[PDB]
Design a binder for this molecule. Structure first.
Ligand SMILES: CN[C@H](C)c1sc(C)nc1C
Length: 284
């Protein structure tokens, strides 16, 4: 029975290696990575791989791994797939921990923009969780943390992390991680999966996929949102993505809104993440 080596980048930046039978479905690998991570609240997570166009795709747990990675390496990342709007409601501290590690990468990468003060506050909770109480012996006036807090670091930011870390004396790791999440969850781009697109006129927009629906970003002064319950049908055709909206009260007809994606694979990918968000946040 022939086995394929799998390499998975974990949220702490380390690498998990295992073997699965070459006909294995995605769920087999996911279950192995989740066991390794001691993670029981698996529904919020998944594995990503890079396609031949170097685009991130979600590994479908129901489909054969080989029919997704196709010509590419069996190389994956472990990631948050569904960002919970209220992380306090997760049943385990270890779930909140992985969510924090994902959000730290979202912030450092610039996927989750964040004010100076919120970067420093998030940083201060990370430092408290990982080192415990502020110690003046480890940090002089010239201290720079090993921790990555932001896409660009300044001495001012390092200073403010320390000033806020001082305030958290006595705080336990689960407590600091819960505070991290109570602040992170409020950021306007929290758990927003962004896709480049054009509207029906050819104007360049971003489409955001998240718990609260499909968001349209254009010019930063005109932001439309379609809550999931309003969306009856999501479809794609060639390079086009379509959402069918419920008729408003006393309106005779549903309305269908159309967008242009870079290519057919980009349209299908946006369709799949929308259907998955629609199902997940209908049930959560
Ligand atoms: C098992 N049911 C949960 C809510 C879902 S729905 C979806 C698209 N993925 C998951 C993990």
């Amino acid at each position: 029975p022939k086995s394929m080596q799998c390499k998975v980048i974990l949220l702490d930046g380390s690498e998990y290696t295992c073997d699965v039978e070459k006909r294995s479905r995605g769920q087999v690998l996911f279950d192995k990575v989740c066991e390794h991570l001691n993670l029981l609240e698996k529904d919020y997570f998944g594995l990503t791989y890079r396609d031949a166009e170097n685009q991130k795709n979600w590994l479908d747990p129901a489909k054969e791994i080989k029919k997704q990675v196709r010509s590419g390496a069996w190389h994956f990342s472990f990631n948050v797939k569904f960002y919970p709007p209220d992380p306090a409601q997760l049943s385990e501290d270890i779930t909140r921990y992985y969510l924090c590690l994902q959000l730290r990468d979202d912030i450092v990468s610039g996927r989750l923009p964040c004010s100076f003060v919120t970067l420093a506050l998030l940083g201060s909770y990370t430092v408290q969780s990982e080192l415990g109480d502020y110690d003046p012996d480890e940090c002089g006036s010239d201290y720079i943390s090993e921790f990555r807090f932001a896409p660009n670091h300044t001495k001012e930011l390092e200073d403010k992390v320390i000033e806020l870390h001082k305030s958290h004396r006595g705080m336990t790791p689960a407590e600091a991680e819960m505070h991290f999440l109570e602040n992170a969850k409020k950021l306007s781009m929290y758990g927003v999966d962004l896709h480049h697109a054009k509207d029906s006129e050819g104007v360049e927009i971003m489409l955001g996929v998240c718990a609260s629906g499909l968001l349209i970003y254009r010019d930063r002064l005109r932001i439309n949102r379609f809550a999931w319950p309003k969306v009856l049908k999501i479809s794609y055709k060639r390079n086009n993505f379509y959402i069918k909206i419920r008729p408003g009260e006393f309106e005779q007809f549903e309305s269908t809104i159309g967008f242009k994606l870079p290519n057919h694979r980009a349209a299908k990918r946006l369709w799949k993440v929308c259907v998955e968000h629609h199902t997940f946040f209908r049930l959560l």
